Design a protein around this ligand. Sequence first.
Ligand SMILES: Nc1nc2c(ncn2[C@@H]2O[C@H](COP(=O)(O)OP(=O)(O)OP(=O)(O)O)[C@@H](O)[C@H]2O)c(=O)[nH]1
Ligand SMILES: Nc1nc2c(ncn2[C@@H]2O[C@H](COP(=O)(O)OP(=O)(O)OP(=O)(O)O)[C@@H](O)[C@H]2O)c(=O)[nH]1
Ligand SMILES: Nc1nc2c(ncn2[C@@H]2O[C@H](COP(=O)(O)OP(=O)(O)O)[C@@H](O)[C@H]2O)c(=O)[nH]1
Ligand SMILES: Nc1nc2c(ncn2[C@@H]2O[C@H](COP(=O)(O)OP(=O)(O)O)[C@@H](O)[C@H]2O)c(=O)[nH]1
Ligand SMILES: [Mg+2]
Ligand SMILES: [Mg+2]
Lengths: 434, 437, 431, 431, 142, 50
Amino acid sequence: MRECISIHVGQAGVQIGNACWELYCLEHGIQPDGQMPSDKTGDDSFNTFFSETGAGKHVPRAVFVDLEPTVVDEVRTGTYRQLFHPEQLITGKEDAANNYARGHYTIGKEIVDLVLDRIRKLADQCTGLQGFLIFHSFGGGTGSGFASLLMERLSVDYGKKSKLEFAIYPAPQISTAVVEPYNTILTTHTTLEHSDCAFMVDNEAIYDICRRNLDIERPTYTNLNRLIAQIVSSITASLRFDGALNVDLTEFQTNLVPYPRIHFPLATYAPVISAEKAYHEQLSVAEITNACFEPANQMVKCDPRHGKYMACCMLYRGDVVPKDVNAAIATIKTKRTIQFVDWCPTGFKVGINYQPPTVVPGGDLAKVQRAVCMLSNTTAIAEAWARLDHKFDLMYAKRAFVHWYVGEGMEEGEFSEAREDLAALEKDYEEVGV
Amino acid sequence: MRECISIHVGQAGVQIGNACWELYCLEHGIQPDGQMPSDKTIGGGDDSFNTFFSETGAGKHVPRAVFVDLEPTVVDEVRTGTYRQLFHPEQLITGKEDAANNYARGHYTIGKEIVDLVLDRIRKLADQCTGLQGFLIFHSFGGGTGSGFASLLMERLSVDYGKKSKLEFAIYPAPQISTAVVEPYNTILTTHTTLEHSDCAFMVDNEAIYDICRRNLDIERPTYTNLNRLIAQIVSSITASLRFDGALNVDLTEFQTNLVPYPRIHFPLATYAPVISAEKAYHEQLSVAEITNACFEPANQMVKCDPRHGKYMACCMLYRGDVVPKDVNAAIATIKTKRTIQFVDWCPTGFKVGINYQPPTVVPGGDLAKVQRAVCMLSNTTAIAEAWARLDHKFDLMYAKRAFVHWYVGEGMEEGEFSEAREDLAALEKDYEEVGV
Amino acid sequence: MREIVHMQAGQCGNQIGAKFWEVISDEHGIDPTGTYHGDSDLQLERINVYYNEATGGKYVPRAVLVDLEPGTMDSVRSGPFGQIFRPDNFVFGQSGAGNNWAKGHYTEGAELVDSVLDVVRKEAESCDCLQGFQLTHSLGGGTGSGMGTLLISKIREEYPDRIMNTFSVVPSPKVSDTVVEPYNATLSVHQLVENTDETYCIDNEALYDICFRTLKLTTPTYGDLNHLVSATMSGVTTCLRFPGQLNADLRKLAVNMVPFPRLHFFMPGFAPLTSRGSQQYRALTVPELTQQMFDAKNMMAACDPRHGRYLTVAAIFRGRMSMKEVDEQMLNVQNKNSSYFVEWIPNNVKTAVCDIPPRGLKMSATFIGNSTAIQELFKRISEQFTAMFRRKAFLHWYTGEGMDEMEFTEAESNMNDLVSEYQQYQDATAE
Amino acid sequence: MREIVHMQAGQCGNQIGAKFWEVISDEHGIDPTGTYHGDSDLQLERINVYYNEATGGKYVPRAVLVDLEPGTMDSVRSGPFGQIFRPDNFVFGQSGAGNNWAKGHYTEGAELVDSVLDVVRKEAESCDCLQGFQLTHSLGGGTGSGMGTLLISKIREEYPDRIMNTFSVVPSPKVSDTVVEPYNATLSVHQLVENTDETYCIDNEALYDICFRTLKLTTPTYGDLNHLVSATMSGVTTCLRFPGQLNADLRKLAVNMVPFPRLHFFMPGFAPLTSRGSQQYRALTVPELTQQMFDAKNMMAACDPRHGRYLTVAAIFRGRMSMKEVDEQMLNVQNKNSSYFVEWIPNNVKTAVCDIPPRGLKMSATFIGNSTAIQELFKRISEQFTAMFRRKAFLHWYTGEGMDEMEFTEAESNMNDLVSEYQQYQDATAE
Amino acid sequence: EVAFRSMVRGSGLGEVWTHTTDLEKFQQYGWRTTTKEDCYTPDTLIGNWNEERFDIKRIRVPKSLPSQYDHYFDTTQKSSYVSGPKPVPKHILHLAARESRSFPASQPELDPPAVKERYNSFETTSRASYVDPKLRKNPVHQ
Amino acid sequence: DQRPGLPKDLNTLEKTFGTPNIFDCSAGELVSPAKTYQQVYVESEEGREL
Ligand SMILES: Nc1nc2c(ncn2[C@@H]2O[C@H](COP(=O)(O)OP(=O)(O)OP(=O)(O)O)[C@@H](O)[C@H]2O)c(=O)[nH]1
Ligand SMILES: Nc1nc2c(ncn2[C@@H]2O[C@H](COP(=O)(O)OP(=O)(O)OP(=O)(O)O)[C@@H](O)[C@H]2O)c(=O)[nH]1
Ligand SMILES: Nc1nc2c(ncn2[C@@H]2O[C@H](COP(=O)(O)OP(=O)(O)O)[C@@H](O)[C@H]2O)c(=O)[nH]1
Ligand SMILES: Nc1nc2c(ncn2[C@@H]2O[C@H](COP(=O)(O)OP(=O)(O)O)[C@@H](O)[C@H]2O)c(=O)[nH]1
Ligand SMILES: [Mg+2]
Ligand SMILES: [Mg+2]
């Protein structure tokens, strides 16, 4: 009755979806061919991610979409070939070349109807859809233009239902591309007004977490995507399994978004640990709650102590006794390092689930009794917005890399409008903070 | 001694009879082979099956039914399935060509050769009787053998047997849910012919039983088997007075004399209504007042018409099981004091009740629960005038430009028979307003 | 125990008839030698409708193959499932018509008419019920069109009441393939419209469109089109062969379909159709079959039903399903697309649910549509005919056989009359 | 007949109702198959108060379980004592309010409330003398503060003569556990002031303190809190259920406690409470029971009795005990504590002793206390409401759904009037 | 929203076909012969290579051992999400002939026995429901 | 490589790390113990003679 549709936009979204669906098949006991191992000895928790087209086979409620047919072709020829729906792996022909204009105006206008028809068929098969989980990046092209185009063309059709966004936000001092400031400025102006909860995960933050808490000095994107897959599994395990008081995709909007223009929390899955450290540790509720407010165990590279906490959503998973959560939150409230905003005496949404987390054979995380995922709305993101504002101003001072957008179809004033929208967002964050 | 002959004509009739006779075998304890597997048997009083079965003198029972269809597939399904040795091979009457949803083919040309053979078989069954209680005709108004040949057979029976009970159970079309195009032509033609040759015309609607199965039994996607089982339960509740001993036994003659006020108002409504499923059946009291109030509900009629738009004239209440008369009297008093149930001004004594000892039996291949108390409500009222008007609307808007008429015209029937039938059913409607006012 | 005699005329008729007799023999569990190897009894219950009993467990198809040249008869007998036919039902001559309707209907066809009528009379008197005749041929050919319509006329003269349906591979707008195809098609349909009870009008370009857009297969070849046509023929005739909840034979379809006797040109459609990669993932449900059945480019006629208005519709479902969902979906599609159905016929959709799914599938549906969109095909053939005829092109071949231009002018008049009847019904108002 | 229609709304309400039905079926001897296997007929003598005899002499509770999503509803059905509930009374939605009082009161919560009113109309019609209605929900939550208060309003309109006793869980001073608790709590208590006859508020950290201190329990999770509240649930109805020396029904308790119609928020308390190790060291007598009742560590609400005045005390004793034991133990408490009781009500303790103790206890006692100590909890919730409403945080959901700021201001003003009435009757002197 | 559309149909990779009108259908994919994405082996990733590799004639042949110089061709989404070689079943590899199909490319060999039994057992409603009412009070076991 | 920090044999993904939650003497056997009425009457009439 309670199902979610996972749209994966861009190469990063497709690889995140690879890790996420591997984890989903693992924790629901689904082989890569789509079959249960039977074994006789009533599980039904898959009926939020796996449509049971009745033959003994379960198919995902996922739409992989991309313009470049490389990473989706890797999925289509890889190990999860006989599991995904063949007409749910939508690919274009041309790439997008980190161009918001080529992802929103030129290449993607002939394929948006196809991806929306697949989404419409999935929703018509669905029977009480909570919402969509859209995995993408603000790097550019498909993840910037096409994902935003999906935001308007899904909000104008459906509305109402949740649209949770998993953005790979650009890092402060490092990145891969160069026009990511332009793409990130252009994405938010068209994505902000049509969204419900759009939270961000940063590459430097995962690199620090993997190098420190996991002792992976040379981590690839596989560890990053697995570590985000654990976050999404912990954010939907309340919908999937039973437990204590449960937080579905409806309270995520009304408990984390105080004002309509500010919907930007931060993830924090923080019993992140390796085998030796977990062997010598006795991981308990107070420790795993105190490990979530540390600036080292943050999923974005920002400064949380130079900011005021708006709201928090605790998602506990495993052998969690409820009063230990309340004692941990009481200790956090008496702590001075964590600062809350004044118009918020009550500021936590606590939800406990009984299902222990699952470990992937071959990986980095260890099997642990307890898990905590914070969804924390704070005012610390204004520093990141200000530094990308500075990057955009430096690149737009003498019209660097503008001719591509202008010749592709983007109007010159669109950059100014997105600049004004980000300036309004900075003023909104300042007014909230004061 | 109180014996009835069942004539199941058409594919719908054959399928409804296939459900009805397995219900009868389950009720009387007869195995599908034809004998009683009671082994110890014991005499006592064991003549309850004589309404529908006859001794062969060797322990086998053959039913008093004739299965008629002009095409050889739905009867051969019966002859091939597990109820093969139960039926006598001569009662399974089949043709060569089907009547092709055509009243003319069913009534004039193809129906003219096999009518003599089926009349001969009915003659043998009537000779194998010690006093015939009546005929139970089962057909569909949808078209073909169930519409043309049924009218031909009942007019031949009216010529031959004369004064006899002629209860029919008609599959009337729904306002929207139907599977044919020339079906309103077939209905308009058959309601003109079977109006003066019948005495009770119990009407059931496919969409209405669909809504019943979707609401009460909560069968979202049912087949014809469930609908046939519900119709069989209705017919079993009707014939329970003839078959099993009870306190107040309402036979066919008592039923008609208490039901029909006029000879052309012989069109009642049936509602057997403990109809809830075995899941949500054993958490409720299921009292006599409860099941009577379930019968007297607008969204329980098994023909698609709202009884609040009309006036009740007669009601017959057939109770089944552990039913005491004081609860019957209290329930009837509450129904009479209810104001949304309007009775017509000229019928003060609007109820005729009758209680049978035997409880309903559960069919293991079905979905109705093993209830202890049952009531089947048969009301003669004026709420079917809107169904008649919808049928007239369909017939008029097709007959305005003479669509599909050439199949009837060039194969027997003349052109003006449609006009005559429309005039006859308009007169029937006018009769219904004269009785209603 | 009904009977339908199958007749194949021409190269197209012989090829898709051979595919038909492959598919229904696989349905009834008959090996290519002729014996019965089925595992059930419902296959053998109604095997007499198309197979005459022979010595032992052999089962001879009730098919008559006719073509003036032996070039396709030798191939259709030597191919797979070709040794099951009776060798006496393979009538052939010396010369060939070859897109020469005049030769197929008047000079070379007329010599073989006596022999093929003797064979068909032999089969019909071997029958004991004889529900009707099905003829498979192609409009736009010599032997299929001309001699096929001549056989249609002779069988209508012999038996004026037994049912008759022609499957009628029809010309397409852009495939063409023949320069005298408008002449052959017009002269054949002039006979068909007055001498046929059910014309089905299957289109080659439409079949390519279905087989490529729905089934992928960038090499859609020839036997695949034969397989699609055979699937539709089997889905049409399945109620005569198998038990079901609500059976409907060819005469029930004709009565519920044809409002007026000249409006009998249909649009076939088979719709549990899915791609090779999508078979293990798709759910064969009744609403989904209804959607694919009423899908516009799932029609095997090249004419779009959106450019018209449906008069009558038949849906032959096969498999175990729920009647409530079936007719509820027909109610839903009528109330949604009420602008594409005539307002003066209520319940435009007849239903026929049989309980035996086709082999290899769980649940199927066959579509018949008597839409007024086939007037586009008729107008296309009319305009090509009047483009060729106004310059007297290719007419000496036809007039050297004993034919005059009066027949061509009559064919113009009859096709234009039929166009007028289809034209006025899509816009005639009730009141 | 004295029947109470029971309702569970929200996740907390559904779980605590399931635990209450488990413990009351344990008290009345009903097994998970709905039959009776008790030892004394006194369990059967007044089954009709909450159960409903089906066919075969089985018993089904008169409980309406409602939630906007199938969640805890399915958990209750799959758990123990789940098949005893009527499947018709498992009314559910498909959407989700989720801490969204506007959505639980004006969206899909407001259309399924017609079905819930129909269910309670059937349950009340199938009775002879209804005592009243009780409902379990949670202020500061989702659907419990939404559909729960809507149900209270509509049922009070339908039957404005029956005793209405909401239990409800109020928000906790320590921890947060939901951010919109002040908004939902104010909007729910604005309905609960004028509609409900009596409310027995539950507070989660008070339950945590009473589990950790007076029973140790290490980790009792949520089910044992539900059990320890269900003890008081049965405790203040056991005079209506079982006979005894002095009987006090719900109406008698309501008139004997409530001084003025606004003043009807009580604190429950169960006090044969022992730890595991001290149960063999403690002696169970009526003075010890009264000591544990009037102990401030047994208060189920976030309230300090020392910072306030007890308006009225109700004491439901269970077991075989003397009468002036109870009478003198309340006389002694009143004489020892003259500064914590209101001076204008002489002997404000209402005592009632029943003859049947609960399971496993020789004697037991339930304390229900109407005080002015609720003022601190309500001024906490009011100041939190003002703190959020000054900056209009989390208000856009409610306003963009359809309520306005006027409703919030009226709710805040009404609850401030309630606080002012508490302070006025606390500070009012006798003469 | 057009009326008689069931589902928009995509091309081998990205192109959609105009379901409304048939005017450019000979320059859409398929009928277009100026292109080249039709005459390659299914190893290459153009055309409907997925649907060609989903065919029986490519499933029946199994994969070989990895070559010597496969470490130069190892991939992150081949070494992270590790997969064993697929043990193609004997009832597929020893397929003598295609059994009774119904439409082109209607391959029922890959279907599991749970759905194969549904059409291999001739399920008719009257016989299936009006069976002896003593075998329906308890289920039958294999 | 994670081996010499861990013990000699430990199958990493098979052993759960952290502390368990011991579950004894819940309030269901403290608030309302299952001791009927005759048993608690006997256990309470023990004593009284002294
Ligand atoms: N966390 C994570 N981030 C990734 C991964 N792969 C790519 N990225 C991010 O994606 C950015 C590169 O641009 P993409 O988002 O991949 O662009 P795209 O979505 O493929 O769309 P195009 O413009 O057409 O290439 C890098 O800066 C990375 O931060 C991944 O596997 N995990
Ligand atoms: N309730 C119910 N109605 C049925 C059943 N079978 C057929 N019908 C009705 O019958 C109508 C179709 O006409 P048929 O009764 O099958 O016609 P026929 O009696 O077989 O006679 P022919 O048309 O000559 O074959 C449909 O509209 C159905 O409503 C059934 O099993 N139960
Ligand atoms: N769909 C389909 N069309 C065919 C087949 N064989 C021939 N045709 C078409 O039939 C037309 C030629 O008709 P033809 O067979 O030569 O008629 P004949 O001369 O009487 O044999 C051509 O346009 C072909 O496209 C076939 O097996 N399937
Ligand atoms: N005593 C008790 N309280 C609970 C339980 N589950 C949730 N709660 C309380 O219920 C409040 C939240 O209400 P909620 O269940 O979300 O309302 P809903 O959204 O309508 O289901 C919180 O303050 C919890 O303290 C439980 O099992 N027992
Ligand atoms: Mg890319
Ligand atoms: Mg029939």
